[PDB]
Amino acid sequence: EEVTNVMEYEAIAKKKLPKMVFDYYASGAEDQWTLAENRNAFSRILFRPRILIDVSKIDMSTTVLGFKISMPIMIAPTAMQKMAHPEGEYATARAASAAGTIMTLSSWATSSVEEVASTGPGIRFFQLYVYKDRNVVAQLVRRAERAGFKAIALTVDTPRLIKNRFVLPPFLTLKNFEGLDLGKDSGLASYVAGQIDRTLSWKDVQWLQTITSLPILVKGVLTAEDARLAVQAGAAGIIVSNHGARQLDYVPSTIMALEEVVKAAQGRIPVFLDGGVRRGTDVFKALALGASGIFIGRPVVFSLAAEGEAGIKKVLQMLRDEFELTMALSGCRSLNEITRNHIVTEWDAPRAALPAPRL
Amino acid sequence: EEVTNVMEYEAIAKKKLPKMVFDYYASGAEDQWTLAENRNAFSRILFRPRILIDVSKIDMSTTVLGFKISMPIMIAPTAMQKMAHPEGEYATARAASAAGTIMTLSSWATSSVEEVASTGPGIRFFQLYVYKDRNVVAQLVRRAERAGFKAIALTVDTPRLIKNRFVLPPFLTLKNFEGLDLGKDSGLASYVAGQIDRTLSWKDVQWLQTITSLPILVKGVLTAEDARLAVQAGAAGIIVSNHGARQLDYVPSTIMALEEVVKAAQGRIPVFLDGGVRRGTDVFKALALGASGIFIGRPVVFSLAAEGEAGIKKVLQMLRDEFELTMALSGCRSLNEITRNHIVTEWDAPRAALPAPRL
Amino acid sequence: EEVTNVMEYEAIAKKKLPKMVFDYYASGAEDQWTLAENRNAFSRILFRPRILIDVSKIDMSTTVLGFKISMPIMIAPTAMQKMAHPEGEYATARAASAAGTIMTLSSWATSSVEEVASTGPGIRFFQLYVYKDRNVVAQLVRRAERAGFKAIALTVDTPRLIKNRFVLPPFLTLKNFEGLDLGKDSGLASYVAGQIDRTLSWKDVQWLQTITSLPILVKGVLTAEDARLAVQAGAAGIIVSNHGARQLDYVPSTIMALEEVVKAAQGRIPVFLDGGVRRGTDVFKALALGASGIFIGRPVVFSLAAEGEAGIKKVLQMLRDEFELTMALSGCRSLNEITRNHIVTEWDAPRAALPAPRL
Amino acid sequence: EEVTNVMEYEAIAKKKLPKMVFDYYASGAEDQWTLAENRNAFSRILFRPRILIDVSKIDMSTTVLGFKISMPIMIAPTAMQKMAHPEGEYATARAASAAGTIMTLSSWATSSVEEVASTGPGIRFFQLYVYKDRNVVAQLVRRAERAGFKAIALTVDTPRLIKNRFVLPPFLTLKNFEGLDLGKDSGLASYVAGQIDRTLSWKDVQWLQTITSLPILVKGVLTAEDARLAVQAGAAGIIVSNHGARQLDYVPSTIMALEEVVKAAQGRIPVFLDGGVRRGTDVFKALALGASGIFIGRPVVFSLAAEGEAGIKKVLQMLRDEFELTMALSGCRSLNEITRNHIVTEWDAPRAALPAPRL
């Protein structure tokens, strides 16, 4: 057999895993997400290649929050990875480290921040929800600090807004909550589901900064308005993400938003994209729209379920290889050379209609 | 079994009812309407959600013509409801009352204004056609006044512009006409079909105001021009509605018109939408376009035919629940917060192309 | 059985007629035309109806070149109609007369101008090609003058630019050429096919005016440029027509052109549309775009083949009835009331985006 | 049997040839190309025909780099043509000569420049890659000069960016490299695949001009920017071409680029189009967009495989015949008359919306 693309792991994982486990990842906690996310939007962006530029050597390295990484391609959090494969987050952490990139560990990981750190050196971010008990937030942040984690990826939605639920077997737990002072008991899983705060505002983002000095990334910004508020709130970065609620027919376009968000941020902080990135051409398109990098979630868990650590390694290498080739075809020798003029979007004014210069 | 959406009652009603009865409601008196009304247009409007706004408590209450109601979702007139279910308009009136909203009673109801009122307290509107005999109009208006009705919903078309006709059985009549002085006889049904006035102009809207002090709602306005004329004619509100004539290939877009009509009305009077509202996301989209509320017709009759009063109650609760969730996902805590900037339409100038501020 | 629409005669004629005869009419001399002409374009024009206008009495009468007719719907030339039905042009002439409209007689009719005139009073136009022998043109024009014909419909293409050919049986001929001085013989059919002039320019349109005082209509104008040249050349009217060459993938849009042509003509002369008009809504749309009337070709021959004179009568009555209803639904009491603001086209600036007045 | 169009040879060649040989030509060295290239884009350009212009005599002759040719239709290089038919490039050269047009000989031809020249008089161009060994470039250029070739068609990509490979049989070689000094051996095929230079820049285009006085054509320009750089680099012409990489989902539009490139070039040098030209209407559309001519590649090899020299002759004659007819239908008597106003593109401002003149 031979796996040739990132989306081909999706079938192998469907087979390998119990239906509910696969659906939980493919479609999220509820059945709200689509697997075809952004595939149409990405399709409708075309390239404007430059020729006769020496691209024999492509540099795709970049810096994220001061940390040098090998490619603008990072790993998004997906919860309880030991459900997907016995090695779980351990495998994700090792592959990320080996590929020279960043892993974000889920708040709901089946492995703790220090377990992840025990695997060796690597730059890691930690997913945080603001829980109702602010002292519990405090304990999570401190544990992640001690484990050497570099940034907070703040998720700002509620996963409560069902059919895709399963139980963690007794041998597996939500390890980041294990051992923490929770105060004055229907199980640990129920606690972390019940205690997500429904009243979150920007004031809470500012509060986070009184308990930690770690850079905070705010996930979910889809508008110029919230991009400005993120900057003013002291966010170190923005993640443009929103998987949608398909049963409600609630679709927001992240891609259309990406450029708007980037422009609003005014170069103050980096802007990342998370959602349906599957091709090297997708990565290129997001960066040309002005994103500083992207995150992939589903492809990592699927390839973990399919081949463990070796599969994650392979997904990252395929994405990487297509990205390099895309840059080469475009005439771009580094990330800096990936300009807005290397793509064309449906909302671009047609260049063929414009008068050409020469006075 | 389990009904999960508003449009799922449509199948149960098809089964339960004789073909002609169902077609009469699904497609109107003639075969001119489409059941897929506005579904495509609504599909092509996307959301612009705001984050980090406390939406734990959503207020969706509003005021319509001075009357407080629990949600911007009201019931449209559908004729002779005892054909759909033995309790007919009685069931519709009770469910509307219980849900804390407004019912509009059809001019052609199988139950009179006072029967409807006998069921208890509730804000109700009455559908009026201007009949050729102006004294008959006078009697209908006075009966509705006496029964405690609050507003006239003036229908301005002729339902004469066939294959979907049935007879009312002998035990059922057009109760609003029963007992009235009709003057100097081929049946009551033929009278109310024959005596609709074909010469109606704005002068007739002004005439209505000499016989009644009730606020008049003008149904059918699809243009800036007629929105201005409605205001100048003394209308208390506008209903943007037009089910189309599909066999003639006569399609007008109500949705495109909604925003135009609202803008033309200049905030003077409320603008409502009637036509193919089925989802909480539809309700949200109409309000963001500037409508003050919406009416649903078909879903009410269908759920009446399927489950009686309990079905209407259920349709209203489903629409309501999806609406709240839509507002929550959008970052809107009240109706006032549902601004034009919370949606994006195909005719909107692309924000991603605009230069972002910061001088 | 029951025929309900204009395009339903198309099947009956397919059955009734030999394949080659039907194809010749459906697809033209060669296989170049499409039967679906303009159906998509017409589909993408929507209505902007006005309400509360008294439309109980619709006047659709108009004047064409000084001649009063009952409706802006006229008959286009289709050749050798005795192939389609034994009564041929005689039947077309009588039905046109009875409906109170204009018939254009084909240059290639199986019945002469005076035969057509022998059927009784009626306003008729004659199709002319400029033949290489200018003296033959002279004879055709004079015969048509003598027969009481009112205008020249000048066709300016060459039908030579095959698989859809048949022979006229011996009892049928090209009657307009019969008896004329042709000078110094492979048959009459070959003569009229061979002697169409390939060198036609606007100078030839001006030449026509030295041999006749009849108003000349120029068929085929698809651009602002040729509309201006038609006016300057002394044309009394323009017919916007071009059936396309589908095998060559040579598509020009007449509909998009219609408005452009009308605007260029600056109200100097009337503009007509010929090509795929089948619905009352089509007629309305062409007039709102600024055409003074339309011609129908295929539907006339088909209904002739299907039911003779009675079928043509029926096609005209169906088109007429749908047109009236379309005007009624639009709030238009006469042709004068059919303004550009009663439709919306894909190239119209969206009114919903504009700011509404009230200073 | 009867071949009626250019794309009908595609099936006959599929049958006649081994799968790998056909795929290599249909889809290129790798499987990256699409056979449907530009077919959709060309479809969405419509005509604006002019009438009453004498087109009985169409002149389609033109001048390319000072050389008079019979039509703006030239032959693109396709490698190793003896794989497609025993006579190979000999057949292509003779048919081009007979049709009075230009052939470009592939760098990878199974026949040398002097063999091609031995067939008789004809204007020919030679495809060049810049190889790592600049002295080998020197030898190729000199051999082509001596053989009477008129221009360099510089290919600037690398065909290395697999499944569609075959071996040349022992009796066939890459004849342009045969006998040349290659210096200090795994076969000739491996040498010419391995020694393509990956570091090419505009400096190399300028270097070409120090070793030859032949006009250089630069293939691959897709942007205003590279069109300007081609002019400044001393290029004698630009070929707008890019077959895409479909497996990578890497699509650039050549057609949209064509007009932009032409405008940027400011009339300094000719602009040609290569890629999916199959119809006379395609040729017309490219010229109206401002191209000076086009090249066809696939249709030539296919018709060679199907009927040898007689097939190429036939492809050229079909393209030619449709082109003439297209010009005739458009009202264009020469290439000069093919203006930008004879087509309409999706990016054109709608003329129907503009106000017509007459002050």
Side-chain angles (χ1 to χ4, degrees), chain B residues 156 201 220 225-226 228 247-248 250-251 260 263, chain C residues 47-48 50-52 279 281 329-330 352 356-358:
Chain B
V156 77
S201 55
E225 302 95 286
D226 292 339
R228 289 175 62 92
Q247 310 288 196
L248 197 55
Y250 194 100
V251 171
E260 177 187 340
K263 284 192 208 184
Chain C
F47 289 101
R48 289 185 80 244
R50 305 290 308 267
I51 66 166
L52 283 166
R279 310 290 292 150
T281 57
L329 283 170
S330 301
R358 254 197 265 194

PDB file of all heavy atoms in Angstrom, chain B residues 156 201 220 225-226 228 247-248 250-251 260 263, chain C residues 47-48 50-52 279 281 329-330 352 356-358:
ATOM      1  N   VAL B 156     -53.371  42.905  -0.294  1.00  0.00           N
ATOM      2  CA  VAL B 156     -53.621  43.831  -1.381  1.00  0.00           C
ATOM      3  C   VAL B 156     -53.641  43.173  -2.772  1.00  0.00           C
ATOM      4  O   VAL B 156     -53.941  43.829  -3.772  1.00  0.00           O
ATOM      5  CB  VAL B 156     -52.627  45.007  -1.299  1.00  0.00           C
ATOM      6  CG1 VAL B 156     -51.246  44.611  -1.814  1.00  0.00           C
ATOM      7  CG2 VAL B 156     -53.187  46.185  -2.051  1.00  0.00           C
ATOM      8  N   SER B 201     -56.503  50.804  -4.902  1.00  0.00           N
ATOM      9  CA  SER B 201     -55.359  51.709  -4.902  1.00  0.00           C
ATOM     10  C   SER B 201     -55.088  52.272  -3.493  1.00  0.00           C
ATOM     11  O   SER B 201     -55.831  51.981  -2.547  1.00  0.00           O
ATOM     12  CB  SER B 201     -55.558  52.833  -5.922  1.00  0.00           C
ATOM     13  OG  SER B 201     -56.775  53.519  -5.704  1.00  0.00           O
ATOM     14  N   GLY B 220     -47.268  43.027   0.984  1.00  0.00           N
ATOM     15  CA  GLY B 220     -46.929  42.948  -0.438  1.00  0.00           C
ATOM     16  C   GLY B 220     -45.916  43.960  -0.974  1.00  0.00           C
ATOM     17  O   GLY B 220     -45.574  43.926  -2.159  1.00  0.00           O
ATOM     18  N   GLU B 225     -40.077  52.380  -3.591  1.00  0.00           N
ATOM     19  CA  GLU B 225     -41.184  53.251  -3.987  1.00  0.00           C
ATOM     20  C   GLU B 225     -42.485  53.017  -3.209  1.00  0.00           C
ATOM     21  O   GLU B 225     -43.078  53.968  -2.701  1.00  0.00           O
ATOM     22  CB  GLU B 225     -41.441  53.172  -5.507  1.00  0.00           C
ATOM     23  CG  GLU B 225     -40.247  53.547  -6.384  1.00  0.00           C
ATOM     24  CD  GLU B 225     -39.430  52.333  -6.821  1.00  0.00           C
ATOM     25  OE1 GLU B 225     -38.697  51.770  -5.983  1.00  0.00           O
ATOM     26  OE2 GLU B 225     -39.541  51.928  -8.013  1.00  0.00           O
ATOM     27  N   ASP B 226     -42.932  51.765  -3.132  1.00  0.00           N
ATOM     28  CA  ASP B 226     -44.157  51.426  -2.393  1.00  0.00           C
ATOM     29  C   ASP B 226     -43.978  51.488  -0.880  1.00  0.00           C
ATOM     30  O   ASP B 226     -44.947  51.691  -0.168  1.00  0.00           O
ATOM     31  CB  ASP B 226     -44.719  50.053  -2.823  1.00  0.00           C
ATOM     32  CG  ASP B 226     -45.259  50.061  -4.253  1.00  0.00           C
ATOM     33  OD1 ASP B 226     -45.578  51.148  -4.764  1.00  0.00           O
ATOM     34  OD2 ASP B 226     -45.375  48.977  -4.867  1.00  0.00           O
ATOM     35  N   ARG B 228     -42.210  53.947   0.593  1.00  0.00           N
ATOM     36  CA  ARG B 228     -42.457  55.376   0.811  1.00  0.00           C
ATOM     37  C   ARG B 228     -43.954  55.705   0.750  1.00  0.00           C
ATOM     38  O   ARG B 228     -44.464  56.489   1.556  1.00  0.00           O
ATOM     39  CB  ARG B 228     -41.727  56.215  -0.238  1.00  0.00           C
ATOM     40  CG  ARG B 228     -40.219  56.248  -0.095  1.00  0.00           C
ATOM     41  CD  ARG B 228     -39.599  57.010  -1.265  1.00  0.00           C
ATOM     42  NE  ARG B 228     -40.049  58.406  -1.294  1.00  0.00           N
ATOM     43  CZ  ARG B 228     -39.401  59.411  -0.710  1.00  0.00           C
ATOM     44  NH1 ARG B 228     -38.263  59.177  -0.060  1.00  0.00           N
ATOM     45  NH2 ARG B 228     -39.881  60.650  -0.780  1.00  0.00           N
ATOM     46  N   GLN B 247     -45.650  29.037 -12.334  1.00  0.00           N
ATOM     47  CA  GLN B 247     -46.063  28.410 -13.575  1.00  0.00           C
ATOM     48  C   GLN B 247     -45.916  29.420 -14.706  1.00  0.00           C
ATOM     49  O   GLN B 247     -45.648  29.065 -15.870  1.00  0.00           O
ATOM     50  CB  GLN B 247     -47.508  27.902 -13.464  1.00  0.00           C
ATOM     51  CG  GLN B 247     -47.807  27.050 -12.218  1.00  0.00           C
ATOM     52  CD  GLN B 247     -47.191  25.651 -12.247  1.00  0.00           C
ATOM     53  OE1 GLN B 247     -47.592  24.775 -11.473  1.00  0.00           O
ATOM     54  NE2 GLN B 247     -46.219  25.432 -13.133  1.00  0.00           N
ATOM     55  N   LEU B 248     -46.064  30.683 -14.324  1.00  0.00           N
ATOM     56  CA  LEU B 248     -45.903  31.820 -15.198  1.00  0.00           C
ATOM     57  C   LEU B 248     -44.423  32.204 -15.305  1.00  0.00           C
ATOM     58  O   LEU B 248     -44.058  33.070 -16.100  1.00  0.00           O
ATOM     59  CB  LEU B 248     -46.708  32.979 -14.612  1.00  0.00           C
ATOM     60  CG  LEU B 248     -47.080  34.196 -15.442  1.00  0.00           C
ATOM     61  CD1 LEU B 248     -47.830  33.803 -16.709  1.00  0.00           C
ATOM     62  CD2 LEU B 248     -47.927  35.107 -14.570  1.00  0.00           C
ATOM     63  N   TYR B 250     -42.879  33.749 -12.832  1.00  0.00           N
ATOM     64  CA  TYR B 250     -42.924  35.092 -12.287  1.00  0.00           C
ATOM     65  C   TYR B 250     -42.346  35.075 -10.872  1.00  0.00           C
ATOM     66  O   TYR B 250     -43.056  34.838  -9.892  1.00  0.00           O
ATOM     67  CB  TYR B 250     -44.350  35.655 -12.317  1.00  0.00           C
ATOM     68  CG  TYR B 250     -44.403  37.152 -12.092  1.00  0.00           C
ATOM     69  CD1 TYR B 250     -44.545  38.028 -13.162  1.00  0.00           C
ATOM     70  CD2 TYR B 250     -44.311  37.689 -10.812  1.00  0.00           C
ATOM     71  CE1 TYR B 250     -44.581  39.397 -12.967  1.00  0.00           C
ATOM     72  CE2 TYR B 250     -44.350  39.057 -10.601  1.00  0.00           C
ATOM     73  CZ  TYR B 250     -44.486  39.904 -11.679  1.00  0.00           C
ATOM     74  OH  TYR B 250     -44.524  41.258 -11.482  1.00  0.00           O
ATOM     75  N   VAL B 251     -41.042  35.327 -10.799  1.00  0.00           N
ATOM     76  CA  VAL B 251     -40.290  35.340  -9.554  1.00  0.00           C
ATOM     77  C   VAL B 251     -39.863  36.779  -9.209  1.00  0.00           C
ATOM     78  O   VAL B 251     -39.194  37.454 -10.022  1.00  0.00           O
ATOM     79  CB  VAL B 251     -39.029  34.439  -9.642  1.00  0.00           C
ATOM     80  CG1 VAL B 251     -38.131  34.624  -8.419  1.00  0.00           C
ATOM     81  CG2 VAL B 251     -39.415  32.972  -9.815  1.00  0.00           C
ATOM     82  N   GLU B 260     -33.961  46.969   1.144  1.00  0.00           N
ATOM     83  CA  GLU B 260     -34.346  48.151   0.370  1.00  0.00           C
ATOM     84  C   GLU B 260     -35.575  48.833   0.957  1.00  0.00           C
ATOM     85  O   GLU B 260     -35.615  50.074   1.093  1.00  0.00           O
ATOM     86  CB  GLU B 260     -34.632  47.723  -1.085  1.00  0.00           C
ATOM     87  CG  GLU B 260     -35.115  48.807  -2.020  1.00  0.00           C
ATOM     88  CD  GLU B 260     -35.540  48.272  -3.382  1.00  0.00           C
ATOM     89  OE1 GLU B 260     -35.125  47.133  -3.753  1.00  0.00           O
ATOM     90  OE2 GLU B 260     -36.279  49.002  -4.094  1.00  0.00           O
ATOM     91  N   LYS B 263     -34.810  50.348   4.385  1.00  0.00           N
ATOM     92  CA  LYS B 263     -34.091  51.617   4.231  1.00  0.00           C
ATOM     93  C   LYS B 263     -35.022  52.718   3.776  1.00  0.00           C
ATOM     94  O   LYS B 263     -34.964  53.827   4.302  1.00  0.00           O
ATOM     95  CB  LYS B 263     -32.895  51.481   3.287  1.00  0.00           C
ATOM     96  CG  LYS B 263     -31.692  50.772   3.891  1.00  0.00           C
ATOM     97  CD  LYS B 263     -30.459  50.939   2.995  1.00  0.00           C
ATOM     98  CE  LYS B 263     -29.495  49.774   3.132  1.00  0.00           C
ATOM     99  NZ  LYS B 263     -28.241  49.974   2.338  1.00  0.00           N
TER     100      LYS B 263
ATOM    101  N   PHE C  47     -38.447  40.348 -11.504  1.00  0.00           N
ATOM    102  CA  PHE C  47     -39.441  41.418 -11.510  1.00  0.00           C
ATOM    103  C   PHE C  47     -39.376  42.323 -10.273  1.00  0.00           C
ATOM    104  O   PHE C  47     -38.991  41.876  -9.189  1.00  0.00           O
ATOM    105  CB  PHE C  47     -40.843  40.801 -11.588  1.00  0.00           C
ATOM    106  CG  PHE C  47     -41.158  40.185 -12.914  1.00  0.00           C
ATOM    107  CD1 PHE C  47     -41.085  38.811 -13.090  1.00  0.00           C
ATOM    108  CD2 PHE C  47     -41.513  40.983 -13.997  1.00  0.00           C
ATOM    109  CE1 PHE C  47     -41.378  38.240 -14.320  1.00  0.00           C
ATOM    110  CE2 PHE C  47     -41.797  40.420 -15.223  1.00  0.00           C
ATOM    111  CZ  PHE C  47     -41.737  39.045 -15.390  1.00  0.00           C
ATOM    112  N   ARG C  48     -39.773  43.583 -10.433  1.00  0.00           N
ATOM    113  CA  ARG C  48     -39.940  44.487  -9.294  1.00  0.00           C
ATOM    114  C   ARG C  48     -41.375  44.997  -9.302  1.00  0.00           C
ATOM    115  O   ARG C  48     -41.624  46.082  -9.812  1.00  0.00           O
ATOM    116  CB  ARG C  48     -38.978  45.681  -9.375  1.00  0.00           C
ATOM    117  CG  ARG C  48     -37.513  45.376  -9.143  1.00  0.00           C
ATOM    118  CD  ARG C  48     -36.698  46.669  -9.136  1.00  0.00           C
ATOM    119  NE  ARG C  48     -36.770  47.404  -7.869  1.00  0.00           N
ATOM    120  CZ  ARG C  48     -37.289  48.623  -7.706  1.00  0.00           C
ATOM    121  NH1 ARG C  48     -37.817  49.300  -8.723  1.00  0.00           N
ATOM    122  NH2 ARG C  48     -37.261  49.186  -6.509  1.00  0.00           N
ATOM    123  N   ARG C  50     -45.091  46.531  -8.560  1.00  0.00           N
ATOM    124  CA  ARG C  50     -45.690  47.615  -7.806  1.00  0.00           C
ATOM    125  C   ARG C  50     -47.079  47.167  -7.393  1.00  0.00           C
ATOM    126  O   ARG C  50     -47.728  46.412  -8.120  1.00  0.00           O
ATOM    127  CB  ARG C  50     -45.756  48.892  -8.649  1.00  0.00           C
ATOM    128  CG  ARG C  50     -44.414  49.330  -9.222  1.00  0.00           C
ATOM    129  CD  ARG C  50     -43.459  49.847  -8.153  1.00  0.00           C
ATOM    130  NE  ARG C  50     -44.106  50.879  -7.352  1.00  0.00           N
ATOM    131  CZ  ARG C  50     -44.029  52.183  -7.590  1.00  0.00           C
ATOM    132  NH1 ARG C  50     -43.292  52.652  -8.599  1.00  0.00           N
ATOM    133  NH2 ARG C  50     -44.663  53.020  -6.796  1.00  0.00           N
ATOM    134  N   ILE C  51     -47.526  47.625  -6.227  1.00  0.00           N
ATOM    135  CA  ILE C  51     -48.823  47.223  -5.686  1.00  0.00           C
ATOM    136  C   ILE C  51     -49.753  48.415  -5.625  1.00  0.00           C
ATOM    137  O   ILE C  51     -49.328  49.559  -5.791  1.00  0.00           O
ATOM    138  CB  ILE C  51     -48.717  46.624  -4.255  1.00  0.00           C
ATOM    139  CG1 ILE C  51     -48.260  47.698  -3.249  1.00  0.00           C
ATOM    140  CG2 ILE C  51     -47.831  45.385  -4.251  1.00  0.00           C
ATOM    141  CD1 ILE C  51     -48.436  47.329  -1.790  1.00  0.00           C
ATOM    142  N   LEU C  52     -51.026  48.126  -5.375  1.00  0.00           N
ATOM    143  CA  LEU C  52     -52.048  49.139  -5.175  1.00  0.00           C
ATOM    144  C   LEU C  52     -52.142  50.087  -6.363  1.00  0.00           C
ATOM    145  O   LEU C  52     -52.324  51.295  -6.197  1.00  0.00           O
ATOM    146  CB  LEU C  52     -51.835  49.884  -3.848  1.00  0.00           C
ATOM    147  CG  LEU C  52     -52.272  49.079  -2.623  1.00  0.00           C
ATOM    148  CD1 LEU C  52     -51.750  49.666  -1.317  1.00  0.00           C
ATOM    149  CD2 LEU C  52     -53.787  48.932  -2.585  1.00  0.00           C
ATOM    150  N   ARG C 279     -42.683  33.091 -23.508  1.00  0.00           N
ATOM    151  CA  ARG C 279     -43.534  33.314 -22.348  1.00  0.00           C
ATOM    152  C   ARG C 279     -43.998  34.750 -22.325  1.00  0.00           C
ATOM    153  O   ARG C 279     -43.310  35.649 -22.842  1.00  0.00           O
ATOM    154  CB  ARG C 279     -42.759  33.021 -21.054  1.00  0.00           C
ATOM    155  CG  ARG C 279     -42.032  31.682 -21.004  1.00  0.00           C
ATOM    156  CD  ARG C 279     -43.002  30.518 -20.912  1.00  0.00           C
ATOM    157  NE  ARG C 279     -43.704  30.508 -19.625  1.00  0.00           N
ATOM    158  CZ  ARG C 279     -44.932  30.026 -19.448  1.00  0.00           C
ATOM    159  NH1 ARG C 279     -45.609  29.516 -20.472  1.00  0.00           N
ATOM    160  NH2 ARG C 279     -45.496  30.066 -18.253  1.00  0.00           N
ATOM    161  N   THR C 281     -43.803  36.396 -19.776  1.00  0.00           N
ATOM    162  CA  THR C 281     -42.801  37.071 -18.952  1.00  0.00           C
ATOM    163  C   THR C 281     -41.611  37.495 -19.786  1.00  0.00           C
ATOM    164  O   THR C 281     -40.968  38.477 -19.453  1.00  0.00           O
ATOM    165  CB  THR C 281     -42.362  36.258 -17.710  1.00  0.00           C
ATOM    166  OG1 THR C 281     -41.861  34.970 -18.103  1.00  0.00           O
ATOM    167  CG2 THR C 281     -43.536  36.099 -16.740  1.00  0.00           C
ATOM    168  N   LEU C 329     -49.533  41.646 -12.699  1.00  0.00           N
ATOM    169  CA  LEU C 329     -48.743  41.325 -11.526  1.00  0.00           C
ATOM    170  C   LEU C 329     -47.693  42.385 -11.251  1.00  0.00           C
ATOM    171  O   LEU C 329     -47.283  42.573 -10.100  1.00  0.00           O
ATOM    172  CB  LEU C 329     -48.073  39.962 -11.690  1.00  0.00           C
ATOM    173  CG  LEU C 329     -48.896  38.688 -11.496  1.00  0.00           C
ATOM    174  CD1 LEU C 329     -48.064  37.501 -11.944  1.00  0.00           C
ATOM    175  CD2 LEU C 329     -49.335  38.499 -10.047  1.00  0.00           C
ATOM    176  N   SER C 330     -47.266  43.077 -12.306  1.00  0.00           N
ATOM    177  CA  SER C 330     -46.213  44.075 -12.196  1.00  0.00           C
ATOM    178  C   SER C 330     -46.726  45.458 -11.833  1.00  0.00           C
ATOM    179  O   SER C 330     -45.939  46.348 -11.490  1.00  0.00           O
ATOM    180  CB  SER C 330     -45.423  44.138 -13.489  1.00  0.00           C
ATOM    181  OG  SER C 330     -44.849  42.874 -13.774  1.00  0.00           O
ATOM    182  N   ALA C 352     -30.441  47.559  -2.826  1.00  0.00           N
ATOM    183  CA  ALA C 352     -30.359  47.328  -1.385  1.00  0.00           C
ATOM    184  C   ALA C 352     -29.090  47.917  -0.770  1.00  0.00           C
ATOM    185  O   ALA C 352     -29.044  48.158   0.433  1.00  0.00           O
ATOM    186  CB  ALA C 352     -30.453  45.839  -1.080  1.00  0.00           C
ATOM    187  N   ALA C 356     -31.070  55.220   0.977  1.00  0.00           N
ATOM    188  CA  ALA C 356     -32.402  55.718   0.659  1.00  0.00           C
ATOM    189  C   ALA C 356     -32.489  57.217   0.915  1.00  0.00           C
ATOM    190  O   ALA C 356     -31.830  57.728   1.811  1.00  0.00           O
ATOM    191  CB  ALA C 356     -33.448  54.986   1.470  1.00  0.00           C
ATOM    192  N   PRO C 357     -33.296  57.929   0.114  1.00  0.00           N
ATOM    193  CA  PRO C 357     -33.483  59.347   0.357  1.00  0.00           C
ATOM    194  C   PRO C 357     -34.449  59.676   1.490  1.00  0.00           C
ATOM    195  O   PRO C 357     -35.370  58.908   1.775  1.00  0.00           O
ATOM    196  CB  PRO C 357     -34.084  59.844  -0.961  1.00  0.00           C
ATOM    197  CG  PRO C 357     -34.781  58.652  -1.523  1.00  0.00           C
ATOM    198  CD  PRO C 357     -33.861  57.523  -1.190  1.00  0.00           C
ATOM    199  N   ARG C 358     -34.144  60.786   2.158  1.00  0.00           N
ATOM    200  CA  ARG C 358     -35.102  61.708   2.781  1.00  0.00           C
ATOM    201  C   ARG C 358     -34.353  62.750   3.604  1.00  0.00           C
ATOM    202  O   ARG C 358     -33.965  62.497   4.742  1.00  0.00           O
ATOM    203  CB  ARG C 358     -36.215  61.017   3.561  1.00  0.00           C
ATOM    204  CG  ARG C 358     -37.535  61.072   2.830  1.00  0.00           C
ATOM    205  CD  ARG C 358     -38.696  60.767   3.758  1.00  0.00           C
ATOM    206  NE  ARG C 358     -39.095  59.356   3.702  1.00  0.00           N
ATOM    207  CZ  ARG C 358     -40.236  58.872   4.194  1.00  0.00           C
ATOM    208  NH1 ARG C 358     -41.110  59.680   4.787  1.00  0.00           N
ATOM    209  NH2 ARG C 358     -40.506  57.578   4.099  1.00  0.00           N
TER     210      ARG C 358
END
